[PDB]
Amino acid sequence: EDAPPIDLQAPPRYLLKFEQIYLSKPTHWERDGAPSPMMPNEARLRNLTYSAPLYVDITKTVIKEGEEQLQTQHQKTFIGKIPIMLRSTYCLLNGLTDRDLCELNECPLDPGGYFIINGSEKVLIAQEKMATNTVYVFAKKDSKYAYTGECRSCLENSSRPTSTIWVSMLARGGQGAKKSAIGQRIVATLPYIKQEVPIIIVFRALGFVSDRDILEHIIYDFEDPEMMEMVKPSLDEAFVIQEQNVALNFIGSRGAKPGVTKEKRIKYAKEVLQKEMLPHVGVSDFCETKKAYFLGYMVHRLLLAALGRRELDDRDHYGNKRLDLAGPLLAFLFRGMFKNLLKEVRIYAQKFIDRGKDFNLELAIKTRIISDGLKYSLATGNWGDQKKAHQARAGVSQVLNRLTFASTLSHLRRLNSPIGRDGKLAKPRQLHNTLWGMVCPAETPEGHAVGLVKNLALM
Amino acid sequence: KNVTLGVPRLKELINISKKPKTPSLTVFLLGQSARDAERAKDILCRLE
Amino acid sequence: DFSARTVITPDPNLSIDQVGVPRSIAANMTFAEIVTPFNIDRLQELVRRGNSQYPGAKYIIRDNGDRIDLRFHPKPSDLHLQTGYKVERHMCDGDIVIFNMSMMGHRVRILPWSTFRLNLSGDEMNLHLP
Amino acid sequence: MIYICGECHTENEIKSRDPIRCRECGYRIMYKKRTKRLVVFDAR
Amino acid sequence: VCASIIPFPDHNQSPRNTYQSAMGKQAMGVYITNFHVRMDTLAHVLYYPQKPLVTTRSMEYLRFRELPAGINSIVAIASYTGYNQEDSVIMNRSAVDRGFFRSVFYRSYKEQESKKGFDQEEVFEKPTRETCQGMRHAIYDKLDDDGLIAPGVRVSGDDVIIGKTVTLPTKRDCSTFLRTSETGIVDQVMVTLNQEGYKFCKIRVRSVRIPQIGDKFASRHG
Amino acid sequence: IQRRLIKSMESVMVKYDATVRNSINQVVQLRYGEDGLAGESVEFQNLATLK
Amino acid sequence: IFTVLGIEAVRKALERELYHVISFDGSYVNYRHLALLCDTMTCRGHLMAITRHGVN
Amino acid sequence: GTGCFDLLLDAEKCKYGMEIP
Amino acid sequence: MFYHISLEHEILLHPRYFGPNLLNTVKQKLFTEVEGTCTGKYGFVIAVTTIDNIGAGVIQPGRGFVLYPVKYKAIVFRPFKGEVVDAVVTQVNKVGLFTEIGPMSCFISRHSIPSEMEFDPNSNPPCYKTMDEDIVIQQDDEIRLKIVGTRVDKNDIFAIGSLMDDYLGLV
Amino acid sequence: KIHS
Amino acid sequence: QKRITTPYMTKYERARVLGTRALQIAMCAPVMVELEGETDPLLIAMKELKARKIPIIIRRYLPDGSYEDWGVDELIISD
Amino acid sequence: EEDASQLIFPKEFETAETLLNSEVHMLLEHRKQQNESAEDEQELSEVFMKTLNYTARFSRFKNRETIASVRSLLLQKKLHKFELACLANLCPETAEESKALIPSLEGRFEDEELQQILDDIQTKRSFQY
Ligand SMILES: [Zn+2]
């Protein structure tokens, strides 16, 4: 539904939109092509992925500059197929009595919850990630700045790739003619701006030209003078920038792709702050007030931590970490193929559109990308598409351990500590207090990877 | 005083990295002040 | 001649220098030995045993350096050996083996079961035969 | 050789280079009943 | 799940509880009920998996009582003949002869004859010494007319259990032998068609292992 | 640490002149252990002419 | 110590630090073995980091 | 042996010409 | 390892290609001779970026084939001896792990693998797993290895690696 | 282990 | 330019240029001049020299190591 | 007679400048794009395809900006060109990891400064998820 409209041009305008998605129960397509039901047990024996067909309704509106708009309906287009977790709502073994499961050569005591790919049972290991739309203030002694205003902000389940902004505060260690006088000033790095721009200027770009409005959104208690003195140095750097247009010009100066003309710099900065920055609080063009308030809160949270009146956020606190299951994981993957699916349709139609003749949709939609795309990572374990120039996250979708029933249960509830900067900075191996009643403390594999892999608590 | 020992120090001994973890120095006093407690405080201040 | 790794079990009866080894592992392992008149008959009987029987020789090397497989045994004359030959007789009792750079040698003793026996005084290991 | 369907469990003779499918079901999985050559078992 | 099955974990040391979590997974036993129908590369099933005498209330929810992975033993803690060190244990030979800890082992072999090349393709048939040029010394009487060994035939050492040949541009033998030298009897044979439509088969070789001096036994903790 | 130490002293050996030298033949110590005695045969004792 | 007292003083200081950590847990090592390690490191007149290759 | 001069091909002069077949 | 180089290659051009704009034929010919091949001295020539210049075409006496010395910019994959680089496992056998370092294939011997590792033929698929099971090397697994030596065979470079050195494995 |  | 060699074409140069061109013509090389039924390759190259169309460029190596690029058309042939 | 650990190799490669696995993918993509559409030519060699997957799988950076930033950051130091691509390609997790993998770095880099360089590479490299 949230897919961008597909536009093709080269007079003949084609607009393709996906209306609704229809999902059927799993079936097996042989050389005859009959939609025979596909039992989960048959998949393992025949070494084929257990999955269900995916169907999408596509509506296309075509205008040839003749002031006559006509559209055609494509009912249940064979977009592709989606692997189905066993015992799920769309699985063939949902709501079935124990008697029926035996008839299908399936263990009634088997809990399910895995995917059968090429005859191999795979379990999507939950990958802990830092919680989104949350403000965290950490202290690092290696960075050039004393404190970090890290806050990764994202919209609902997923509309755009996650964007993170670090509202840092320069350390007092550095000394200079003017730096020492003002001392500690706040600098905010925008996601698409390479250099660190002062946070005060960001508010000016929003529309709050008046300096008092800046203090109003940051400092809620004017009676308290301790916090007020901390924000004074930040104003000095941004003081010369009084007009909002200048602030927009200032931000666009260090943009990733600065515009050749002066007016383009303002437009690029306007788009970055409006869309790239703080997507979760607002994505439209009339959320300047809302965006500023959240931005001021991030500064306000930094002020409390800097003064010490607020305790620093704990890196290992599980409340600050979110767990990504087969649902959230596959949701991110589905966008990879779907985004590529639009490109394949666009590229295929591009050569057709310029020639002037209509392009059939049956050839445009690619089933292999949707089918093989999900099947690839779920089998090898390398998350994401292989073609993309990146490093895939290995260790996900491991072979289910069927040596013992207890092992199978533990593997399905298995958890994985975050990898990369988040895991490296924190101590995932060490047992934290938050694990009480949520993650089993005793259970952990022995070896170098001790504590990284855990198991969900029973309740 | 916290003096790093064990593997962390053994690693820092074979490795000649210029900056160890806790490069402590032991100062031995001599003369009359070496016995008195107060007379050793001024040395403490003048070193700290 | 690296052997197949197998688990370790204790055996106080064996001496600390001695090490227990199964028949199957010792059968695969071979120890080239130069035949001499004082032990010409000893090699003559062992080669006759064949590879089906555990106390046999996997290969026999002539003076010219040619290796003849004893599994086939095509001609009785080829089985016969002359002085100065090298025979890869299977490991037997009293042989010296070395395993875990400081390595400790041991005297192999053949035992019925499969697992290795060590007079500790668990972890898998492979024993090398010089 | 004689095989057994995995759904109806009925005998179906399948020759060499013949499609693997049950006439009564169309099931694509077939098993082998047993070998007439018996083996020796010792209670140990 | 793995820590719940442990009685008195509070009475136990933290590393021991963590150590059991690894050992519990490595424990062999009845993993599911429909093990005969499925084909798994590695599957160890215990002869007599009985529920423990000391069981936790949470064990009921895990269903470990229905499908346990061990056999209780009357253990006498003593130093007998000095044949047991800190990492060792002494068993009762007579008990093993009665089925004390015996278990089965299943190894599934898979192979498909696919027409990868127009000129050269794979087929299932008996690799006769005459029609085949390149072959490895092994007994081929086990294979049937279809190139697949029928269930109920004892297999030991190096033996061909599925016949496959490639018609190189005369055919070259490329059959699959036993992974190890263990003596086992084929349990069941399955012939199917893979997703590509080519003939594909799976066979489960079943072998019986008797506990011996080399087997590793672990308690529920330690 | 064990592997690193062995490599840096793998070539260190006692030559026939009762000297410790490496592969390059550089004199690491004039006498092994500064006394020229094996570390296994030495036994702990306390001479009583100083206390 | 190297920049203040010289390489020769480091040999004794290195011995003391090596012995201090080894004797902290009650374990003991023959002095000859400890002296050999210090001599090799200081054999070239300057402190030498132990070979990081560690192939053997 | 007649090596004081070398024959070099020129692309500019090859711009004109039709193949006999 | 990938490098940027400027190489020289003498292009043999048939007189049949002496038609108009023959330099284009020489340019396109260079995209087939030095492209996709593997010189034993500079390694695999994976791709060609651009052409520097084309030298004068000297006609070889008697042969009648014009020789065109052309300079081009290309990227080569030359495995230097004693260099540690990531690799991808393509197959596993009792002899040892078979890795794939980009265009070439590198073989790891059993002895070079640490003694703790033990080959498992029962596990599907095969993977060198130690007894502790902490580290396992499956197929298509990103592992780091050090090339002890490289040999050139049949116009191809074959490399031998090892994992005895520290920090060589899954990480 | 041994059968391998 | 600044070429000091004789404007005329030596007999040795003429023989090699025609021989190399004739070999090229026999190898399906294009012919600049019009073809009026001359089958023998030497005749095809001979008229090419007459019409000053041979693409071959003569690089005369001076004894001092310098070279001069003299075109066949530029050189004065004798007919 | 050549060894990468001791920084000994044929003199020809000295003039050559090293390239990153992710960066080479961009160059291969540029080569792939023109061949696919710009000119009608035979399909690319199997060698080209094999290295393209290797670079893509091990690509540690998303866009040119990330690649350029790391290249510029490491250029400021005295890092040798051979180590420039080797360090970036390997992505050592910690300083101790790099020195053992790269013996050359131990010669002229301290345990502290290099750690401040590897962690910078970590902040630049990104995962697909
Ligand atoms: Zn049926």
Author numbering:
A (entry chain N): 60 to 69, 81 to 529
B (entry chain M): 1115 to 1162
C (entry chain M): 360 to 459, 467 to 487, 498 to 506
D (entry chain X): 15 to 58
E (entry chain N): 706 to 874, 888 to 940
F (entry chain M): 860 to 910
G (entry chain M): 1365 to 1420
H (entry chain A): 1467 to 1487
Kindly provide excerpts from the paper associated with this entry.
The addition of DDM at a final concentration of 0.008% (w/v) increased the amount of Pol II dimers observed on the grid and enabled determination of the structure to 3.5 Å resolution with C2 symmetry enforced. The dimer is formed through a handshake-like interaction between the stalk of one Pol II copy and the active centre cleft of the other copy. In the resulting 2-fold symmetric arrangement, the two stalks are arranged near the centre of the complex with the cores of the two Pol II copies on the periphery. There was no cryo-EM density for the clamp domains in any of our reconstructions and no significant protein degradation was observed for either RPB1 or RPB2 by SDS-PAGE, indicating that the clamp is mobile. The Pol II–Pol II dimer interface is formed through an intimate interaction between the RPB4-RPB7 stalk of one Pol II copy and numerous elements of the core of the other Pol II copy, formed by RPB1 and RPB2. The stalk nestles deeply in the active center cleft of the other Pol II copy and buries ∼2100 Å2 of surface area per copy. The residues in the dimer interface cluster in three areas of the Pol II core that we term interfaces A, B and C. Interface A is formed by specific interactions between RPB4 of the primary copy with fork loops 1 and 2 (FL1 and FL2) of RPB2 in the partnering copy. With respect to the two other interfaces, interface B is formed between RPB7 in one copy and the site that binds the DNA–RNA hybrid in an EC, including the active site of the other Pol II copy. Finally, interface C is formed by interactions of RPB4 and RPB7 with RPB1 residues 1417–1419 that are located in the switch 1 region that connects the Pol II core to the mobile clamp. Furthermore, RPB4 sterically clashes with the incoming downstream DNA, the OB fold of RPB7 clashes with the DNA–RNA hybrid, and the tip domain of RPB7 clashes with the upstream DNA duplex.
